[PDB]
Amino acid sequence: TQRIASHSHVKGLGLDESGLAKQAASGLVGQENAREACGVIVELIKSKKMAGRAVLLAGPPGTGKTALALAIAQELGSKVPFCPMVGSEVYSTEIKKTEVLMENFRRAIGLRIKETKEVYEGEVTELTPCEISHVIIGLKTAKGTKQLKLDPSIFESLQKERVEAGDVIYIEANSGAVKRQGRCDTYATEFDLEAEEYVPLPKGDVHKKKEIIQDVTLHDLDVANARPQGGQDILSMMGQLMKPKKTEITDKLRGEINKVVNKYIDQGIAELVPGVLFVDEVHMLDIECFTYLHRALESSIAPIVIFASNRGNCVIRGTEDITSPHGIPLDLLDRVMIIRTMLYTPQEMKQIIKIRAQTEGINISEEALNHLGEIGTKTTLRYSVQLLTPANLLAKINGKDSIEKEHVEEISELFYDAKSSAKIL
């Protein structure tokens, strides 16, 4: 079955119709103010007309900032691009961190493009070339037989796939892609033992045109056009042998792709679904990255950006002495809306522990739940929810189907939290 992760319990922000946060709903308890603000931001993303708007989730560790970001993602649904990111990911060996930030900005903007797909599929009845401007290929389906004049590119892809006759092939005219999916079924009976696989002949038309919606991001278009993989000319073929490094895509390519996308939007063949970029541990970005974000958020194309930071007066990385509130420069803090996450009361921690127990399929007695809540008050919320699985394992070893207080005590003694460990250090 599905593996249980640290956020598997969050299914939404748990807000009612008016946007007010239910005390406990959709796997979230407490943080009602932050959840309501995140609902407002969800409405902002769904409104779809504002670009480059940034929010900052500020609060000590354990307060649920990443949980709230993933709750926003759940609220939006899989349709809207949610790009998760960590501040440590900008430091790439191939491209400048500004390029990484721009790429993440571009893949948080999604496109749904309706494309007409031209398909030729059938049994190859004949394959006659003409000097090499032509290939006359006959294709047979259940509906009938047709012979088609195809480009040298499609012929030479057919030679790549090694289709001779009686072979069932699938040609996509748009991409010039040929698939030899086997030999026809009528030739299975030829031999007792033959070294190929037989497929029934296609039952549709030889020439089929199909309208399909493709989900792509602006980054997909940028990368495809900066590392072209279509086209069969020798020059591009020999460039395909290069190590596929990430390149610092220029603003000109992005502007050209913007023009193309605008044309598609005008033609009605595409719809823009701008999403959200989630940069967790934004404090890891250095001063250069923040100062670039200054410009990247002014763009009319930018997505909604969510930052999360748990640092209190950290030095800005790269500055070596400049202390800013959240490890973030003040000039960037002037561009963001700060959502603050507060610490949890013992009761909220107990509710969260019960929710995590339910998600991990663990039965915990009331005594055990109270003891674990007491431990979490003493140690941390994260420590307590981690004890649940080992405690359940010990309970199964004892042959009981529930976590009693003794199992929690045993696991508490076996393992330590940061405070106990620091004490013994």
């Binding site: 494309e115 699938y170 996509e172 278009l221 495809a224 056009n225």
Partner: protein, 49 residues
């Protein structure tokens, strides 16, 4: 009838389709023909090096 079709095979009600890439037309970059004539240099000024 629909339920019987689903019971026989779900591919009767919704087929599994091939997964395809989006073919984007090549980007046309326009520029003047005089640009390519840069670095040409005049014959009768190029010696034999």
């Amino acid at each position: 009838v629909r339920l019987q079709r689903i019971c026989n095979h779900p591919g009767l009600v919704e087929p599994r389709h091939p997964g395809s890439s989006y073919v984007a037309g090549p980007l046309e970059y326009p520029s003047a023909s005089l640009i390519l004539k840069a670095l040409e240099r005049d014959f009768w000024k190029e010696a034999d090096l």
